[PDB]
Design a protein around this ligand. Sequence first.
Ligand SMILES: Nc1ncnc2c1ncn2[C@@H]1O[C@H](COP(=O)(O)OP(=O)(O)O)[C@@H](O)[C@H]1O
Ligand SMILES: [Mg+2]
Ligand SMILES: [Mg+2]
Ligand SMILES: [Mg+2]
Lengths: 44, 518, 74, 63, 48, 78, 96
Amino acid sequence: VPSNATFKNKEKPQEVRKANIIAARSVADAIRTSLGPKGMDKMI
Amino acid sequence: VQIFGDQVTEERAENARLSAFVGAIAVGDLVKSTLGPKGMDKLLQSASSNTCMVTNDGATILKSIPLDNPAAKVLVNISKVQDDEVGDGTTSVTVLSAELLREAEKLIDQSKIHPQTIIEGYRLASAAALDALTKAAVDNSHDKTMFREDLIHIAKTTLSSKILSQDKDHFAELATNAILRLKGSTNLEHIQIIKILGGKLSDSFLDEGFILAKKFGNNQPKRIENAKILIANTTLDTDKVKIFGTKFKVDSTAKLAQLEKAEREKMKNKIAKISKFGINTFINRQLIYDYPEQLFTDLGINSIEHADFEGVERLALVTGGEVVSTFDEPSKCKLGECDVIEEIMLGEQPFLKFSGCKAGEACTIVLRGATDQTLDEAERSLHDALSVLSQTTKETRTVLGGGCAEMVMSKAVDTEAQNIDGKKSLAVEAFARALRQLPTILADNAGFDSSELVSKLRSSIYNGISTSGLDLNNGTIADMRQLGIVESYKLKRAVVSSASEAAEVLLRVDNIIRARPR
Amino acid sequence: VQIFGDQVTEERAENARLSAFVGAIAVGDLVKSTLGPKGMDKLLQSASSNTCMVTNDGATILKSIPLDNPAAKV
Amino acid sequence: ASALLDQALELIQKGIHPIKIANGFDEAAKLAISKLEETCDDISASNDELFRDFLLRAAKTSL
Amino acid sequence: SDREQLVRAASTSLSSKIVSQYSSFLAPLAVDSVLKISDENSKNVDLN
Amino acid sequence: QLFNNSRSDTLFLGGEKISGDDIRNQNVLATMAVANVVKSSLGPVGLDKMLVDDIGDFTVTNDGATILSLLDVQHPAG
Amino acid sequence: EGVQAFIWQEFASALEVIPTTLAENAGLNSIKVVTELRSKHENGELNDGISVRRSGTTNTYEEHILQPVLVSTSAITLASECVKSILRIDDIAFSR
Ligand SMILES: Nc1ncnc2c1ncn2[C@@H]1O[C@H](COP(=O)(O)OP(=O)(O)O)[C@@H](O)[C@H]1O
Ligand SMILES: [Mg+2]
Ligand SMILES: [Mg+2]
Ligand SMILES: [Mg+2]
């Protein structure tokens, strides 16, 4: 059950995908406050 | 004594080499994860302009990433040459050329073999590998039914690694019909690719006729039935008089008023010669002024201006006519006919659509995607698929893919390795194990154990069955004839030839002299 | 979010497993030619006083040569 | 601890007050301890011969 | 062409826009603009 | 007000982005800073103000139309 | 009965962010609304939604609140195609 089959290598892509999701959800949080009739305008 | 100068980096002997081996390992590991249908795409961020690109092609990755290693550029150039001559397999060439050095790294180290002796091992191994791959090829184009079916299997194999792999089932017919309409002429200038935002990837449809984005004249109607299409090389513009090199000498303004009127009648007489053809549609290569445009309204002639150099030949072949310059003789330059010139709109930009033309010698592909990162890859995904399908028209020899081709070539290498006396026999067996690294990575990127799949595939071919291959969906050994995996012989021959020659260059480098950068 | 302070080098990925194995290769290749009766001695250049030391033993060679790689310190 | 914070971040985005999240973890902590306390058994009834075996069992796990 | 379905959908699509309070006369404005171009083929209705 | 907020944590912006009540607080201070001028100039009992271009010339303007025109305000809401 | 089914459970819960945001921006409690949303949407086939004027759950058709189908259809399609493109990035390399 252990020690057999295969072992995962180069686990950085697992962290790269996490860094891409966290950075994308951070952008979606600022625009989330503008959703619906109760949303607010964003001055840039 | 330092003869070279200040700030001159040089490595010699064991320092000179192992700079080329680490260079191939660093370059090979970048495209190692992109090999196979389960491979992962790599994102490239530019140091300036903040431009990002998502690409699965091993050639486009090596061109964007700056590399100061002289041996790294060796693997970059072979990826461009493989992209120039074929366009597919650029990732496999970089990996296979790197695995030849990884095996040769232990040959000089563990077995203590001279580098030139290893070169003689690849020469005898590559000669036997190309002979076994040629005999495994199957003749094509003898039957028009089998020729069309083989092109569908090639498009499914190339697009398997692309992001199109989900929708490639519907895209196999998209890329196949574009090649059959070329009538044997191989060019990608006749195939147009338009990017559109919105929808889904599978919404991409094949264009009947030729579609090119243009705009009608101000007073010209959108839809004309049975319109005649003509393309003119000459542009309607102020020509001076004839030879240029002149200016008017006006003694009195009484003749100056009739002088400008004479220039208005010159372009008016040129349109009168065009109206002798009875055309309902006119196409110009460059911008048309408003003065000649009004002459097309009274004559019922459509106008298309600002045509690109590629758009001139794409439109002329679909309609069947040829580009007219002098307009003098009406009998020459017989013109085709288009059924529907009515313009449609895809997205926020209207696209002029044609239907029911005489010839399909040129094609147009419409692509729809969510972001430009997908559209940038969707164009390069079909560009690699249409390149192999276009080369398959002239080159009919095809072989089985799916990791089977690399294993069949390695079978003949181990057969002739037993009859080769000397230390160069170890370099011959190293070429066979290097061919097994390509199907090994196919299992690693798919999440399956490579030691189990390669061992079952290696022992199955020695039993006399050459149709066995790797199935990544079920994670077992399956037949390539049933799964429909077919690749062209020119594709696999270019991978083995380019990788074997690239590894020979870096094994011949005993010194590296780096001049001071400018 | 970076929990570590400034000028803190860490490798959580393939770069760590690569640096650990290659770090032992340079250590093994240094004392490789010193194994056997046909081996050759090594020269040590001192950073102070310019005192040269020539020894075939691998214990003095590894302790005298500074090594910042933890894989080498093992 | 980080697993409790990962599940709490999802509850904060839903509009739950952080104190209401902490109040739920305190009540759920005593329910888990009281449940596992009833499942375990007392090994003190064994003699000194068997008591040494239980010490060898937990030793190999921590090693 | 339905004045009940188009106007109520145009004012609802405004939502948080600053014109929501001005949507009284603006909702028939966007409806009557599209109704001037009618086709049975459901063309994209160019906004030029 | 108070202490400056952290700069783009996980947000990865090249500029400065502040959220919460700090924006509406600075927006009020933008209108209150420009009001204290116009305030004392209102009514018959109001007094004129003198604006200087640093080049040696002065400008006496009672109403806030030219005052706000001459004074450079870089605040977006100001 | 598969690992693909376990992913679909998170796909349905991911769409709840839109009605949750409507309550957060309006000051109402999201769970108190969703608790009423799950009960009313079980018997009712459609038109049950959140109304910002009445601050609660009521019939959106009687309130005239309506949106085209192409707005919601493209929102689900474009979101699924973007997630597929993001999850395929295994690394980010500096280029020229
Ligand atoms: N559907 C499939 N099943 C099994 N193997 C495949 C499949 N599609 C592609 N391959 C293998 O992946 C390898 C790489 O294919 P391709 O992407 O065309 O070249 P590259 O990866 O060099 O761009 C090929 O050698 C082929 O054997
Ligand atoms: Mg390919
Ligand atoms: Mg422990
Ligand atoms: Mg809206």
